[PDB]
């Protein structure tokens with residue numbers, strides 16, 4: 001879940 | 012409307 | 023200009039010496055009467071036109087009552103003490119379907135009130151600030167209510183810093199429970215409107231009147 | 237201990253240089269990306285475990301975005317300026333069925349922000365306080381988030397009183413718009429969930445993801 005959010009925070 | 016409330020505030 | 027915390031503390035001490043939902047609703051109806059007497063003891067509240075006094079109470083009764091039984095339950099473990107002298111335990115609330123909101127009250131309000139040892143004077147002021155809500159729709163003179171709210175928090179901050187000089191962030195910590203109170207207040211109303219719709223759950227006349235439009 | 241308003245103001249300046257509902261939803265999806273970059277620039281936000289960073293943003297995105305376009309619209313007469321460069325006038329909002337909530341934004345947020353001339357530093361701090369919500373359910377370490385929130389308002393109060401020495405009630409007046417923001421934030425979500433249910437109104441992937449459970 002919350003795919004987009006995670007990807008954005010990690011980068 | 013708001014019968015009870017009015018009566019209580021006036022007294 | 024003129025809004026002593028002594029008068030506010032006094033308003034507080036003056037008003038307060040099976041289905042858990044039903045018992046809670048009966049308690050809320052009972053406290054609605056006491057809430058009117060409380061407000062009347064808040065400086066300058068009665069000097070406002072009756073129409074605005076009605077607007078302010080109809081707009082804040084729920085948060086006002088939620089703050090009261092929350093502070094009153096700071097001693098209790100996992101439950102709250104109703105004004106009627108009955109205790110609603112966490113498990114009891116959960117077994118009646120209202121577990122989620124009940125937990126939010128314990129976690130966001132009661133617990134926090136207990137962790138900082140919020141005193142009666144502080145509670146009184148916070149309720150006075152909630153009472154004097156300038157955003158209430160329909161106010162004949164919002165600026166006048168806004169002015170009163172500022173005098174309450176001006177007095178409250180002075181009280182803090184003088185009573186708790188070692189806690190420079192107390193005043194802010196107190197005001198910061200308000201968004202939570204607003205949130206919990208809205209959720210409690212939703213449940214209440216739903217209880218009325220469903221038909222079950224007796225709702226007394228004063229509480230019912232609060233559910234009237236607008 | 238360490239939470240300079242200079243870093244916060246910078247996060248603010250760094251992120252921001254027909255159916256009105258559709259246009260608003262497109263704007264919100266666009267700002268959701270920018271919101272992530274903003275938070276990353278808030279001191280100590282990135283040092284928190286990714287799981288909690290996700291929780292904080294999922295819990296405050298709506299209030300965070302509402303505060304931003306509200307402060308951004310302080311110049312506009314009766315409407316708000318979207319991040320996409322489009323203006324939504326009060327009449328336009330009313331003609332699309334969202335007049336009531338739109339008016340609440342103008343009355344409770346924009347107007348008030350304009351009346352006190354809330355500056356960018358103040359806005360930044362208020363959003364930082366909203367971001368650092370210790371009540372967010374699921375936080376691995378609520379106390380740690382609570383500590384950060386206190387440093388933001390500690391810095392904010394210092395900023396006030398030093399920048400606006402003649403307004404001893406400014407700090408409190410700023411925090412007192414938070415309950416309104418919370419209320420308006422919850423109402424905006426209800427509308428959004430309803431728009432999704434109804435089917436009409438395109439909802440982009442990031443906005444849609446925010447409507448996911450929990």
Ligand SMILES: CC(=C/C=C/C(C)=C/C(=O)O)/C=C1\CCCC(C(C)C)=C1CCC(C)C
Pocket residue numbers: 043046047049050051053083084087088090091102103104105106120123124127210211213214
């Ligand atoms: C407006 C409200 C008022 C309370 C008043 C009292 C109980 C006051 C006093 O005893 O001192 C709160 C209500 C009323 C509608 C139903 C519910 C719940 C059952 C949804 C709640 C919230 C009750 C909390 C403890 C979870």
Ligand SMILES: CC(=C/C=C/C(C)=C/C(=O)O)/C=C1\CCCC(C(C)C)=C1CCC(C)C
Pocket residue numbers: 257260261263264265267297298301302304305316317318319320334337338341424425427428
């Ligand atoms: C969560 C929310 C976010 C906004 C983001 C933006 C527009 C940001 C930017 O442009 O800077 C607010 C929403 C989203 C769901 C629908 C509505 C309304 C149409 C119900 C509102 C509230 C819009 C206000 C102006 C009344």
